Design an enzyme around this catalytic site. Structure first.
Site, PDB file in Angstrom:
ATOM      1  N   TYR A  72       0.828  -1.224   0.000  1.00 53.02           N
ATOM      2  CA  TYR A  72       0.000   0.000   0.000  1.00 53.02           C
ATOM      3  C   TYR A  72       0.859   1.270   0.000  1.00 53.02           C
ATOM      4  O   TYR A  72       0.329   2.358  -0.357  1.00 53.02           O
ATOM      5  CB  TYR A  72      -0.877  -0.017   1.232  1.00 53.02           C
ATOM      6  N   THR A 129      -7.641 -12.729  -0.063  1.00 53.77           N
ATOM      7  CA  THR A 129      -8.456 -12.770  -1.281  1.00 53.77           C
ATOM      8  C   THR A 129      -7.797 -11.970  -2.387  1.00 53.77           C
ATOM      9  O   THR A 129      -8.084 -12.154  -3.507  1.00 53.77           O
ATOM     10  CB  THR A 129      -9.854 -12.224  -1.013  1.00 53.77           C
ATOM     11  N   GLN A 351     -13.220  -2.175   6.870  1.00 53.41           N
ATOM     12  CA  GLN A 351     -13.619  -3.537   7.249  1.00 53.41           C
ATOM     13  C   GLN A 351     -13.250  -3.713   8.710  1.00 53.41           C
ATOM     14  O   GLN A 351     -12.217  -3.185   9.180  1.00 53.41           O
ATOM     15  CB  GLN A 351     -12.958  -4.625   6.400  1.00 53.41           C
ATOM     16  N   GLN A 382      -9.410  -2.431   8.699  1.00 48.58           N
ATOM     17  CA  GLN A 382      -8.758  -1.834   7.531  1.00 48.58           C
ATOM     18  C   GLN A 382      -9.530  -0.567   7.136  1.00 48.58           C
ATOM     19  O   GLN A 382     -10.738  -0.651   7.017  1.00 48.58           O
ATOM     20  CB  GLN A 382      -8.679  -2.823   6.380  1.00 48.58           C
ATOM     21  N   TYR A 423      -1.115  -3.763   5.936  1.00 49.16           N
ATOM     22  CA  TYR A 423      -1.960  -2.581   5.642  1.00 49.16           C
ATOM     23  C   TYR A 423      -1.241  -1.360   6.181  1.00 49.16           C
ATOM     24  O   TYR A 423      -1.738  -0.677   7.080  1.00 49.16           O
ATOM     25  CB  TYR A 423      -3.337  -2.674   6.297  1.00 49.16           C
TER      26      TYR A 423
HETATM   27  C1  LIG Z   1      -3.162  -4.996  -3.440  1.00 51.53           C
HETATM   28  C2  LIG Z   1      -3.990  -5.864  -2.513  1.00 51.53           C
HETATM   29  C3  LIG Z   1      -3.485  -6.151  -1.228  1.00 51.53           C
HETATM   30  C4  LIG Z   1      -4.160  -7.009  -0.348  1.00 51.53           C
HETATM   31  C5  LIG Z   1      -5.375  -7.610  -0.762  1.00 51.53           C
HETATM   32  N1  LIG Z   1      -6.058  -8.467   0.072  1.00 51.53           N
HETATM   33  C6  LIG Z   1      -5.483  -8.797   1.231  1.00 51.53           C
HETATM   34  C7  LIG Z   1      -6.085  -9.780   2.053  1.00 51.53           C
HETATM   35  O1  LIG Z   1      -7.150 -10.333   1.732  1.00 51.53           O
HETATM   36  N2  LIG Z   1      -5.429 -10.141   3.219  1.00 51.53           N
HETATM   37  C8  LIG Z   1      -4.249  -9.586   3.626  1.00 51.53           C
HETATM   38  O2  LIG Z   1      -3.692  -9.994   4.709  1.00 51.53           O
HETATM   39  N3  LIG Z   1      -3.665  -8.646   2.869  1.00 51.53           N
HETATM   40  C9  LIG Z   1      -4.246  -8.258   1.737  1.00 51.53           C
HETATM   41  N4  LIG Z   1      -3.618  -7.319   0.911  1.00 51.53           N
HETATM   42  C10 LIG Z   1      -2.379  -6.701   1.394  1.00 51.53           C
HETATM   43  C11 LIG Z   1      -1.161  -7.568   1.064  1.00 51.53           C
HETATM   44  O3  LIG Z   1      -1.079  -8.684   1.952  1.00 51.53           O
HETATM   45  C12 LIG Z   1       0.068  -6.705   1.195  1.00 51.53           C
HETATM   46  O4  LIG Z   1      -0.094  -5.632   0.239  1.00 51.53           O
HETATM   47  C13 LIG Z   1       1.326  -7.532   0.924  1.00 51.53           C
HETATM   48  O5  LIG Z   1       2.471  -6.993   1.609  1.00 51.53           O
HETATM   49  C14 LIG Z   1       1.580  -7.574  -0.556  1.00 51.53           C
HETATM   50  O6  LIG Z   1       2.635  -8.501  -0.873  1.00 51.53           O
HETATM   51  P1  LIG Z   1       3.348  -8.338  -2.279  1.00 51.53           P
HETATM   52  O7  LIG Z   1       2.368  -8.201  -3.386  1.00 51.53           O
HETATM   53  O8  LIG Z   1       4.382  -9.394  -2.404  1.00 51.53           O
HETATM   54  O9  LIG Z   1       3.987  -6.857  -2.119  1.00 51.53           O
HETATM   55  P2  LIG Z   1       5.428  -6.174  -2.350  1.00 51.53           P
HETATM   56  O10 LIG Z   1       5.136  -4.738  -2.517  1.00 51.53           O
HETATM   57  O11 LIG Z   1       6.158  -6.908  -3.402  1.00 51.53           O
HETATM   58  O12 LIG Z   1       6.195  -6.430  -0.979  1.00 51.53           O
HETATM   59  C15 LIG Z   1       5.624  -6.094   0.287  1.00 51.53           C
HETATM   60  C16 LIG Z   1       6.726  -5.994   1.325  1.00 51.53           C
HETATM   61  O13 LIG Z   1       7.357  -7.290   1.486  1.00 51.53           O
HETATM   62  C17 LIG Z   1       8.715  -7.226   1.067  1.00 51.53           C
HETATM   63  N5  LIG Z   1       9.023  -8.439   0.325  1.00 51.53           N
HETATM   64  C18 LIG Z   1       8.306  -8.945  -0.728  1.00 51.53           C
HETATM   65  N6  LIG Z   1       8.832 -10.066  -1.207  1.00 51.53           N
HETATM   66  C19 LIG Z   1       9.957 -10.286  -0.420  1.00 51.53           C
HETATM   67  C20 LIG Z   1      10.936 -11.298  -0.431  1.00 51.53           C
HETATM   68  N7  LIG Z   1      10.876 -12.323  -1.284  1.00 51.53           N
HETATM   69  N8  LIG Z   1      11.959 -11.220   0.465  1.00 51.53           N
HETATM   70  C21 LIG Z   1      11.979 -10.154   1.289  1.00 51.53           C
HETATM   71  N9  LIG Z   1      11.098  -9.155   1.406  1.00 51.53           N
HETATM   72  C22 LIG Z   1      10.099  -9.273   0.511  1.00 51.53           C
HETATM   73  C23 LIG Z   1       8.872  -5.952   0.283  1.00 51.53           C
HETATM   74  O14 LIG Z   1      10.221  -5.479   0.247  1.00 51.53           O
HETATM   75  C24 LIG Z   1       7.901  -5.041   1.021  1.00 51.53           C
HETATM   76  O15 LIG Z   1       8.509  -4.578   2.234  1.00 51.53           O
HETATM   77  C25 LIG Z   1      -5.924  -7.299  -2.035  1.00 51.53           C
HETATM   78  C26 LIG Z   1      -5.279  -6.424  -2.893  1.00 51.53           C
HETATM   79  C27 LIG Z   1      -5.884  -6.073  -4.238  1.00 51.53           C
END
Ligand SMILES: *Cc1cc2c(nc3c(=O)[nH]c(=O)nc-3n2C[C@H](O)[C@H](O)[C@H](O)COP(=O)(O)OP(=O)(O)OC[C@H]2O[C@@H](n3cnc4c(N)ncnc43)[C@H](O)[C@@H]2O)c(*)c1C
Length: 468
Positions: A72, A129, A351, A382, A423
């Site tokens: 976000y 989701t 939510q 949220q 979030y």
């Molecule tokens: C866009 C979106 C987000 C949602 C949605 N629905 C959710 C739900 O139903 N439950 C939830 O618990 N969360 C929901 N979210 C939020 C997402 O969970 C978060 O937005 C996640 O953090 C998203 O993960 P991702 O798409 O992988 O995001 P990035 O921006 O790539 O990274 C986030 C964060 O983590 C670090 N990071 C990612 N990958 C790694 C690895 N492999 N190693 C180390 N660190 C990693 C990134 O650097 C960053 O800090 C529904 C919707 C539509």
């Protein structure tokens, strides 16, 4: 960039600044918070991730991994310009083994995870989701979805991980190997290097799982006791129910999922229906992949793997992890929603999720068992405010969302509440954010950080600072 020439010479694939490839990997999900990396590495192998990390460490550049890019606040970029960004969405392998364990690359999006586990073995993980969300960011900070109260957060079924440390060294961790790193990755997993594999114990994907909705016609007189009755029902309800309350200017609605059939769901909800009065439950029994498809939304790709992924929104969000509230606290909240919320021109929504209760898997671990601290809270809120793709987000939106949250949090005891790192709230003070996300786990996380990332290369404004 010496860092770009380092990457090219190490045979790490990269995106040229300003190219279409750079725009494809380098456009933040949130249009409110675009960032410009120093370099974008696009590895297809763990060896390329190691080389990319070594290149960043050698040149003292901050390093951020991006899996699905759904942050976000654009933390996969580092939440600022100038990082080495390691794009992982070319690595989306899901491998299920005959013993029900699965090895998954973090660049796999949740819809691809769900599709592959379903098709390979009628198996599942407890994830959220959205189908476009990366499993990397989701699982490294929690991962809350429609079977959380039965199966936990995504990270509750994690049994192992492979991490590229900030030295470039590839290590394995588990409850029994580098257990301090494995603890930190399970809730604060951006802090310690690039996760390149996650291992989980899957569960059998339900044959019968019922989604449900309850339409409500509440106002300032009925909403406080309705929210309180919702919360009190949640404390005692069976693990098979996960549900939430949605609120906007359009009013109030319950949505959830029940592991079991429609008749059983209707019997299980009848006490809550009787608390409210004059409501009808709508409900449909489907299988797990049907449930994943239903919550993805009409016309969304439920199995996204393409490098051309380009979902966007233009928004500000916040969250609250809260203990059970009093009815007076719900009255303060409903008063804000009924006055400031009602008269707002903003397209805001929120939510209220029941994460806890006697039988919840989310609230079974103690706060100190993983880096994920909010095991003692009952509710997850949220708060969301969105504008069109071509609008600028207005600064009065920050005060609207702060006011919505503080209508609850300003009445809570200090240290009893926080925020959800999945979030993230861009507006909170930098060290106040670390306390909101990780609470009483911050001290141990700083010691893990001092051991695995002493130079603090894996940083963002709200991240853990190294302290032995
Ligand atoms: C866009 C979106 C987000 C949602 C949605 N629905 C959710 C739900 O139903 N439950 C939830 O618990 N969360 C929901 N979210 C939020 C997402 O969970 C978060 O937005 C996640 O953090 C998203 O993960 P991702 O798409 O992988 O995001 P990035 O921006 O790539 O990274 C986030 C964060 O983590 C670090 N990071 C990612 N990958 C790694 C690895 N492999 N190693 C180390 N660190 C990693 C990134 O650097 C960053 O800090 C529904 C919707 C539509």
């Amino acid at each position: 960039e010496a860092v770009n020439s380092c990457l090219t010479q190490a045979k790490v694939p990269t995106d040229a600044q300003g190219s279409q490839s750079w725009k494809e990997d380098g456009t933040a999900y949130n249009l409110r918070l675009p960032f410009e990396p120093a370099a974008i590495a696009v590895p297809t192998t763990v060896a390329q991730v190691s080389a990319a990390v070594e290149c960043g460490a050698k040149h003292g550049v901050a390093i951020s991994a991006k899996s699905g890019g759904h942050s976000y606040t654009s933390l996969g970029f580092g939440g600022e310009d100038g990082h080495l960004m390691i794009e992982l969405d070319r690595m989306y392998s899901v491998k299920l083994a005959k013993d029900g364990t699965a090895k998954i690359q973090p660049g796999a999006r949740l819809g691809h995870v769900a599709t592959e586990l379903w098709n390979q073995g009628k198996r599942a993980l407890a994830h959220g989701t959205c189908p476009g969300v990366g499993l990397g960011g989701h699982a490294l900070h929690g991962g809350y979805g429609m079977v959380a109260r039965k199966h936990g957060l995504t990270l509750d079924l994690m049994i192992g991980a492979t991490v590229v440390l900030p030295t470039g060294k590839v290590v394995h961790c588990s409850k029994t190997e580098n257990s301090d790193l494995f603890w930190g990755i399970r809730g604060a997993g951006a802090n310690f290097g690039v996760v390149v594999e996650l291992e989980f114990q899957t569960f059998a994907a339900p044959e019968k799982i019922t989604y449900f909705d309850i339409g409500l016609n509440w106002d300032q007189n009925t909403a406080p006791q309705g929210l309180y009755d919702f919360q009190e029902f949640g404390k005692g309800m069976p693990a098979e129910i996960t549900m939430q309350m949605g609120v906007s200017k359009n009013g109030y609605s319950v949505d959830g999922a029940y592991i079991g059939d429609e008749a059983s769901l209707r019997k299980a909800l009848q006490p809550l229906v009787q608390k409210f009065g004059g409501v009808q439950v709508t409900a449909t029994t489907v299988d797990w992949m049907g449930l994943v498809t239903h919550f993805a939304g009409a016309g969304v790709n439920v199995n996204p793997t393409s490098a051309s992924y380009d979902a966007h929104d233009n928004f500000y969000a916040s969250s609250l992890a809260a203990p059970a509230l009093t009815l007076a606290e719900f009255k303060s909240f409903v008063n804000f929603v009924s006055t400031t919320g009602k008269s707002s021109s903003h397209s805001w929504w929120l939510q209220m999720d029941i994460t806890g209760g006697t039988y919840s898997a989310v609230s079974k671990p103690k706060p100190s068992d993983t880096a994920y601290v909010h095991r003692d809270t009952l509710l997850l809120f949220q708060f969301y405010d969105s504008v069109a793709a071509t609008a600028q987000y207005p600064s009065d939106g920050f005060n609207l969302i702060k006011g919505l949250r503080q209508s609850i949090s300003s009445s809570l005891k200090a240290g009893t509440w926080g925020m959800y790192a999945n979030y993230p709230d861009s507006q909170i003070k930098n060290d106040r954010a670390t306390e909101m996300y990780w609470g009483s786990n911050v001290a141990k996380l700083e010691a893990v950080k001092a051991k695995y990332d002493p130079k603090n290369l894996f940083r963002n404004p709200q991240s853990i600072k190294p302290k032995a």
